[PDB]
Amino acid sequence: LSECKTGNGKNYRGTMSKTKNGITCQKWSSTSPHRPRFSPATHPSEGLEENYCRNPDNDPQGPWCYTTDPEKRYDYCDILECEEECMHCSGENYDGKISKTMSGLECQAWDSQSPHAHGYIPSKFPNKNLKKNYCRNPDRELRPWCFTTDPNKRWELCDIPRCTTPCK
């Protein structure tokens, strides 16, 4: 179940419980410090649950909570856009669109079974994002990768960009 934002965040449903600035959020179904305009009462099916981040009002700036700080009512929250640029760290996360290995071989689709038998079945690891055949890192491996369509190369890693040019 999806842990990153697309567009203004309507369908966001990760579990970020704090504004862009540290402050832990107010549960949506509470009244102190503030009194909110979207109660799981009023806008029921709008993922208004827990204290997690949400965009009920269809805000331009996206997902946002009310802060437990009486002093600033509500504020926005941080939340990686989807798609992906460059891997963060070793990118246990990577949700990007790259399909050609280091060697430079186009990846074999996760869905597929050729030219290689493999148990990385997306069915089996739904949250794991085995889209088409985008390079990935399910298993705490060095850096994402795939099973390559060169029948003699099972798999190998790809050359994903580090955003900030073990981990820090």
């Binding site: 493999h118 148990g119 990385y120 690891f125 794991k128 399910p138 298993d139 705490r140 798999w155």
Partner: peptide
Amino acid sequence: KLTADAELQRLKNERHEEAELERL
């Protein structure tokens, strides 16, 4: 070892283990 991890862990190892054995 149930869950993913146990599982992935294993896959990975299996891979790792197999490259291991081709470079040889």
